[PDB]
Design a protein around this nucleic acid. Structure first.
Ligand SMILES: [K+]
Ligand SMILES: [K+]
Ligand SMILES: [Mg+2]
Ligand SMILES: [Mg+2]
Ligand SMILES: [Mg+2]
Ligand SMILES: [Mg+2]
Ligand SMILES: [Mg+2]
Ligand SMILES: [Mg+2]
Ligand SMILES: [Mg+2]
Ligand code: NA
Ligand code: NA
Lengths: 178, 220, 148, 96, 170
RNA sequence: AUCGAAUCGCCACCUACAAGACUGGAGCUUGCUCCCUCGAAGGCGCCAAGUAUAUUCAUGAUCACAAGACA
RNA sequence: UUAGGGAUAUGUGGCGUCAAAACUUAUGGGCUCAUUCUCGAUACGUGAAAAGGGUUGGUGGAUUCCACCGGCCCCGAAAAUGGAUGACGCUUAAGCCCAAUUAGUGAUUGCCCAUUAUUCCUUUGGUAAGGGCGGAAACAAAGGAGAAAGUGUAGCCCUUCCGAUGUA
RNA sequence: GGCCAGAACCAGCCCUACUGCAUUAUCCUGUCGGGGAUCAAAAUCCGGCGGGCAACGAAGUGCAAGAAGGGUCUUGG
């Protein structure tokens, strides 16, 4: 399945006024499900960093950054999440993916699973493709050995939806009730 | 056991010996709840179902977890009069029938008809052995339903530890059934082999265009 | 191209003359026949499906009760003009096997022409056998997934 | 429940696409009464006279994702004693 | 072990979805769930991600490196002759036959019915011959064992006279 | 003997069995190679007792429970 | 949020059976084992703390171990009729967090349920809105009939729009 | 026939089938240098430079303005 988050670059600024005639222009990476969310997150960052509210700002550009060609890579995701008990926790995790949006979506599912952290409490600081020799965790490093091979065991190969049956003769494929 | 009127009327009618459309399910290594749900839905759809080998149904978890579950169920009883209380059945086929009954609208006539369409056996009794090829329920089989690292229980063992007293009888009867069936299968190997060789030579005896037709549809 | 015109027809293109059809209802349900024409004013189809092969006589049938298959016999040499609506028009009763000689002769002529036309096609023996076969829905068959 | 619409499960029809194929087809529920009453072709074909009776309807639309179909019966709702009993789905009106 | 490992170069068949029953080569392993699949000789099989639940590992493995170039993949696949060997197997023929059955017309189904029925009839003929020679059918072996006894004790005088009288009566 | 019914796939080849972390067989290098029965069909049945030189079907008239059912 | 009826589509809530819906969806990622109190699936709300310890996550140091911080599970956790995630059951979940809509294919509506929404038909009432009402000309039996200047009736007749629940 | 049923057409609704415009660069390709790893490689990665359309149904990114098969016992003819 394709990643649920897209890679956005939102470019905006405070509206020029008499007190700020040539306001600074800010570039903001963010991984979001749609561009409305991406711009919402951009304005949150503008507010909490530059003290610029959305009601006094401009969106110069909001564009999806396309993913590169799909290659089995190692991804360093620098990510932070907030919880009431522990405040902000920042971690740097490694992931096997084929795109940056894939690695980031995987990181979000991972933080949701192992830390019960939801999307809006998560900030991604940096995602970066790294070489194999700079990979630190053995659970990621095992996957780039030259002779990597494994069988597929304990698999549940369900039939195609059209050919699925309720009752089947014990040692045949003869469907009885379907 | 038919009445004398039923036999006399059938004798008058000249009709042959009839058997309704019945599906026979081999429940060995089937997940108890999933098989029960599938069977219940098919019974509400009007199917006539006989299930065999209920003593080899499976439940996830260790045997002690599920025996303790059964004992918890067993202590439920109407204090002021245990007759008319919940009736706790110990036999595995009875357990499956109860599991299916709890998955039916048992207090309507429709649910009652559905429940009375189901026959449950331990082992495979002689009246069922020869009625036709038995079926499985793929979405309710242990080898695709349970991760094999997990412990699981066989229903007959739990039942015999909670009061079922027919475990050894069913074991001996199943051994005899398998021995008789395997003798009858080793014999008739020559008949099956004769039919296989007959089809192989029929290929060389039929017209050629028909052979090509079989080839393109994957039969030759 | 006039709706009032007898030539008006909205019949689906697969029910072309000469196409072999599966009869879905009526006396000859499951018999494969041959579509010869459609009667004027967007009327029913007429099928012979030569009575020698399957027993279907010259009969009219609504196209909502056939499966017109993609297998066809070229019947351009059959002369379906004498098959008319008046052929099946019947002078009814009043205060109340058997075939009129005209109907019998028309059956003979159409049937001879159709049998020759069928025998003139490649895999024509196979097509005669196909016209002799009976269609039935068997246990386990999914006709909604089939091509025809 | 709303009895004006019946749900029918057809053998070998296990996707919404198959049920789509069956949309518009004629549907029949065959049963018997106690007495012999009037049938179609009562005078023309007296061998049709029977306690047997049929109730007719049409498939209106699929139901769910797994091949179930909604059926509207002519004039009146199908009787609830038909629940769990056989239903005929014919191949006409045909589109092929 | 006889199980075909997931590895770089392994041929796979797509189990379900838009590419069901197509063949591709594993060119990279992402993680425990995902591999990169390409087959240069199938036009719908450009390099793409397949989940490992959706592939059948085959018994062939061209010899390529991970994240190999397209040219190396094509040259190795052509030299290894994996597609040819796979096509000569019966499961590939079964996939082809399923494809032909799916597209079959009514006349094609009738032709197949005729061919199967002709085969069945001819197998019946061969079986009847061999059954006459050496009995394995129920009726034939019953006939043999009851024939030994029928000819053992029909030579009786009363039996022969009764048989003659019955032949005369009819 | 009421009695008209609803039901629409047969089988003396499925109607034995076990395993799914190992499925026909080998080998040693233990996941690859070599062999085979090449690993994704229970057998029939669907209108000539079998694939062809055939042979009765109507008027039951265009849908109606198949107007018939020991395959 | 409500005239009484159909169709279509939703809301909240759901989609293993009960029970309509994934006939147990995916060609989605993780996590979790629990023995007489039953682990979990309990918005409101209807079963808990201080404190502590299996598994798999994080941070910071030392050479695999040291400390610290999360997730899920476990202990802490005792009441009186037999009993309650609603029941059965579920553990390649039918549990928890996250995310999809037939799936790295080629684009942005899977499905099921309302007295809601849209639309069609009928009723009834308006702070209702418009037309027609000077008989149009002719016309017997072996095209018919009606046409009232009107609050209210079987409402003069036609068209149109909107509302319609309710204790005292 | 003012009753039951089936097909045709019509009008109105309701489902189809068919998709163009803009955008991509944190991208695509060649070659130098490094860096990597094993028996040696290639690759994952980083900087340059020369070229560029990743164009299969390119991409699941923004907006789509594509007239006319099947449903109506969900309407009236
Ligand atoms: K609806
Ligand atoms: K009014
Ligand atoms: Mg006791
Ligand atoms: Mg009948
Ligand atoms: Mg349901
Ligand atoms: Mg599921
Ligand atoms: Mg509940
Ligand atoms: Mg109104
Ligand atoms: Mg009121
Ligand atoms: Na309310
Ligand atoms: Na999962």
């Amino acid at each position: 399945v394709k990643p649920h988050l897209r890679h956005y670059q939102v470019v905006g600024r405070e509206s020029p006024s008499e007190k700020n005639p040539e306001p600074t222009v800010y570039k903001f990476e963010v991984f979001a499900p749609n561009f409305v969310v991406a711009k919402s997150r951009f304005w949150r960052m503008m507010r909490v960093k530059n003290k610029v509210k959305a009601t006094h700002g401009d969106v110069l550009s909001c564009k999806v950054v396309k993913d590169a060609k799909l290659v089995a890579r190692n991804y360093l995701v620098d990510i932070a999440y907030y919880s009431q008990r522990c405040g902000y926790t920042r971690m740097v995790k490694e992931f096997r993916d084929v795109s940056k949006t894939g690695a980031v979506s995987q990181a979000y599912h991972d933080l949701a699973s192992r830390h019960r952290a939801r999307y809006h409490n998560i900030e991604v600081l940096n995602v970066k493709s790294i070489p194999d020799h700079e990979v630190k965790h053995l659970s990621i490093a095992q996957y780039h050995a030259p002779n990597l091979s494994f069988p597929l065991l304990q698999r549940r190969t369900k039939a195609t939806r059209k050919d699925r049956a309720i009752f089947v003769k014990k040692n045949t494929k003869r469907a009885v009730v379907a | 056991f038919p009445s004398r009127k039923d036999a006399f009327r059938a004798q008058r009618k000249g009709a042959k010996k009839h058997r309704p459309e019945i599906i026979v399910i081999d429940l060995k290594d089937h997940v108890l709840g999933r098989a029960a749900a599938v069977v219940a839905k098919q019974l509400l759809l009007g199917k006539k179902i006989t299930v065999v080998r209920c003593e080899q149904l499976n439940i996830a978890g260790t045997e002690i977890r599920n025996k303790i579950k059964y004992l918890q169920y067993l202590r439920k009883r109407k204090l002021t009069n245990p007759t008319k209380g919940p009736f706790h059945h110990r036999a595995p086929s009875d357990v499956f029938v109860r599991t299916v009954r709890s998955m039916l609208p048992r207090y309507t006539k429709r649910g009652m008809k559905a429940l009375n369409s189901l026959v449950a056996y331990e082992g495979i009794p002689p009246n069922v052995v020869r009625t036709g090829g038995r079926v499985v329920i793929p979405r309710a089989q242990r080898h695709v339903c349970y991760r094999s690292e997990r412990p699981y229980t066989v229903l007959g063992n739990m039942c015999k530890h909670v009061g079922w007293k027919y475990s050894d009888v069913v074991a001996n009867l199943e051994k005899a059934r398998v021995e008789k069936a395997s003798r009858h299968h080793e014999k008739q190997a020559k008949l099956r082999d004769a039919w296989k060789s007959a089809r192989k030579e029929a290929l060389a005896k039929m017209p050629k265009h028909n052979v090509e037709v079989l080839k393109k549809f994957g039969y030759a | 191209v006039s709706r009032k015109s007898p030539e008006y027809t909205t019949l689906r293109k697969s029910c072309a003359p000469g196409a072999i059809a599966i009869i879905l209802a009526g006396r000859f349900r499951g018999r494969r026949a041959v579509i010869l024409k459609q009667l004027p004013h967007n009327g029913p189809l007429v099928v012979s499906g030569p009575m020698k092969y399957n027993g279907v006589p010259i009969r009219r049938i609504d196209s909502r009760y056939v499966i017109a298959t993609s297998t066809t016999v070229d019947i351009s040499s059959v002369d379906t003009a004498p098959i008319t609506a008046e052929v099946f028009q019947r002078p009814k009763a009043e205060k109340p096997t058997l075939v009129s000689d005209a109907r019998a002769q028309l059956q003979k002529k159409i049937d001879a022409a159709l049998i020759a036309a069928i025998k003139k096609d490649a895999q024509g023996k196979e097509k005669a056998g196909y016209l002799r076969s009976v269609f039935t829905v068997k246990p386990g068959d999914a006709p909604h997934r089939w091509n025809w | 429940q709303t009895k004006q619409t019946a749900l029918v499960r057809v053998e070998n029809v296990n996707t919404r696409e198959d049920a789509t194929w069956y949309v518009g087809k004629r549907v029949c529920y065959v049963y018997h009464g106690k007495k012999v009453k009037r049938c179609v072709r009562w005078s023309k074909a007296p061998a049709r006279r029977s306690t047997t009776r049929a109730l007719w309807g049409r498939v209106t639309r699929p139901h769910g994702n797994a091949g179930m179909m909604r059926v509207k019966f002519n004039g009146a709702s199908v009787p609830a004693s038909a629940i769990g009993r056989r239903i005929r789905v014919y191949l006409y009106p045909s589109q092929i | 072990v006889k199980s075909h490992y997931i590895c770089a170069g392994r041929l796979v068949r797509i189990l379900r979805g838009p590419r069901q029953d197509r063949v591709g080569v594993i060119v990279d392993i992402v993680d425990a769930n995902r591999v990169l699949v390409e087959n240069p000789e199938d036009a719908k099989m450009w390099r793409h991600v397949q989940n490992l639940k959706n592939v059948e590992p085959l018994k062939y493995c061209v010899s390529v490196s991970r994240n190999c170039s397209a040219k190396a993949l094509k040259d190795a696949l052509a030299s290894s002759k994996a597609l040819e060997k796979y096509a000569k197997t019966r499961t590939a023929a079964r996939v082809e036959a399923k494809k032909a059955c799916a597209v079959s017309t009514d006349f094609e189904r009738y032709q197949l019915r005729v061919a199967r029925r002709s085969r069945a009839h001819w197998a019946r003929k061969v079986f009847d011959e061999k059954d006459a020679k050496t009995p394995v059918s129920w009726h034939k072996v019953a006939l043999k064992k009851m024939l030994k006894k029928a000819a053992k004790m029909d030579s009786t005088e009363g039996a022969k006279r009764r048989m003659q009288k019955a032949i005369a009566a009819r």
